Design a protein around this ligand. Structure first.
Ligand SMILES: CC(C)C(=O)N1C[C@H](NC(=O)[C@@H]2C[C@H](F)CN2)C[C@@H]1C(=O)NCc1ccc(C#Cc2ccccc2)cc1
Ligand SMILES: [Zn+2]
Length: 296
C-alpha cells in the first residue's frame, strides 16, 4: 500500500538548443537507484561533472535557474525539473552534452511526453515528502514568496506586467491535471528586450518555436496562446521546477507575488534552514495519503 519512489523504465533521448546559449545540446535521461534524487551530468567534460539538482548547488538566478560546481554550470533546469516534479519522478540521471538544458517548445510538454512514452518504474522504497509545518515567507521590495501548511499540494501566482497584452492563477493538484493544465504553458519574452539581451549573449536560442514573443500590443506567434492565462501558468510551471530543488515532492501550499528564480531560491534556503517549519514524511498506505499519482 506504500507510496513508492519512481524512476524511468527506459532511457529518454532528446536533441535541442539552449534558450540563452543557442548551443545544440544532446539530453539523455537514465534510471537511477533509490534515494539518488535528480542529478545533472556534463558528459562533454572529462572527467564528467555531476551536480545534484538541490538548492545548495544553485548559482546564477537572473536568466533562469542555474546549477554550479566550481567553474562548471548547467543553465535553465526549471522546465525539466517541473516535468519531473509533475510526474512524481524521484531518481534520475540527466546527461547533457553542453551547459544548457534544451528549451524544446518553451514548456514542460515535450519532456512530459518523452518521459511518459518511456514509462516510469516504481522502486521498492517509500517516497519521501517535505511537509510544510509552519508558514515561511520571504519578501524583497514588492515581491513575496510564501510556503503555507496544507494537506495536499497547491500553487498560487500573481504577476503584474504594465503591458496591454497582460495575471493571477491557482492550481490544486487534487483537481488540476499538471499534464493538461500546466505542462504546456510556454516561456515568454518582450520583443523590446531582445536586441539588448543578445548583446549580453542571452536569448541567443530564442524563436517563435520555443517562446511566446510579445510586441508593443500583440503576441507575434501566428497560432497565439495555448491557455487564456498562459503567462501566469508558465510562472506556476517555473515555481514547481524551482520547488523541486528541495529534492522531494512537497506537502504544502506555495504563493508567489511577482516572484522569480532569485526569491524562490531565497524561500527554499529559508525553509531548509528553519527545521521547525518542515519534516520528511512517508505514506505506508496510499489510501490515507493527502496526494495521489497517476499509474506509472
Ligand atoms: C519579462 C521577464 C524578465 C520575465 O519576468 N519572465 C518570466 C518568465 N521566466 C521564465 O520563463 C524562466 C526564465 C527562462 F525564460 C526559462 N524559465 C518569462 C520571462 C523571461 O525570463 N523570459 C526570458 C526570455 C527571453 C527571450 C526570449 C526570446 C526570444 C526571441 C524570439 C524571437 C527572435 C529572437 C529572440 C524568450 C524568453
Ligand atoms: Zn520558464
Amino acid at each position: 500500500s506504500m507510496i513508492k519512489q519512481r524512476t524511468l523504465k527506459n532511457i529518454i533521448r532528446a536533441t535541442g538548443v539552449g534558450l540563452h546559449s543557442g548551443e545544440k545540446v544532446y539530453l539523455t535521461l537514465k534510471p537511477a537507484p533509490v534515494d539518488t534524487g535528480i542529478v545533472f551530468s556534463r558528459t562533454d567534460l572529462d572527467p564528467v561533472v555531476e551536480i545534484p539538482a538541490r538548492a545548495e548547488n544553485v548559482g546564477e538566478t537572473t536568466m533562469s535557474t542555474t546549477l554550479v560546481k566550481g567553474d562548471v554550470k548547467v543553465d535553465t533546469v526549471e522546465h525539466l525539473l517541473s516535468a519531473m516534479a509533475g510526474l512524481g519522478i524521484d531518481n534520475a540521471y540527466v546527461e547533457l552534452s553542453a551547459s544548457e538544458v534544451p528549451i524544446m517548445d518553451g514548456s514542460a510538454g515535450p519532456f512530459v511526453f518523452l518521459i511518459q512514452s518511456a514509462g516510469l518504474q516504481e522502486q521498492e522504497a517509500a517516497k519521501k515528502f517535505i511537509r510544510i509545518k509552519r508558514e515561511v515567507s520571504v519578501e524583497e521590495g514588492d515581491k513575496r514568496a510564501v510556503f503555507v501548511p496544507f494537506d495536499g499540494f497547491k500553487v498560487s501566482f500573481e504577476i503584474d506586467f504594465d503591458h496591454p497584452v497582460f495575471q493571477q492563477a491557482s492550481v490544486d493538484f487534487s483537481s488540476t491535471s499538471f499534464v493538461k493544465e500546466v505542462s504546456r504553458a510556454r516561456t515568454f519574452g518582450f520583443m523590446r528586450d531582445i536586441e539588448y539581451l543578445r548583446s549580453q549573449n542571452l536569448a541567443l536560442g530564442g524563436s517563435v518555436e520555443n517562446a511566446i514573443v510579445v510586441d508593443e500590443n500583440r503576441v507575434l506567434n501566428e497560432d497565439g496562446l495555448r491557455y487564456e492565462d498562459e503567462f501566469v501558468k508558465h510562472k506556476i510551471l517555473d515555481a514547481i521546477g524551482d520547488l523541486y530543488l528541495l529534492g522531494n515532492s512537497l506537502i504544502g501550499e506555495f504563493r508567489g507575488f511577482k516572484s522569480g528564480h532569485a526569491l524562490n531560491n531565497q524561500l527554499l534556503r529559508t525553509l531548509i534552514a528553519d527545521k521547525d517549519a518542515w519534516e520528511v514524511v512517508t505514506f505506508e498506505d496510499a489510501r490515507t495519503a493527502p496526494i495521489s499519482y497517476m499509474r506509472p
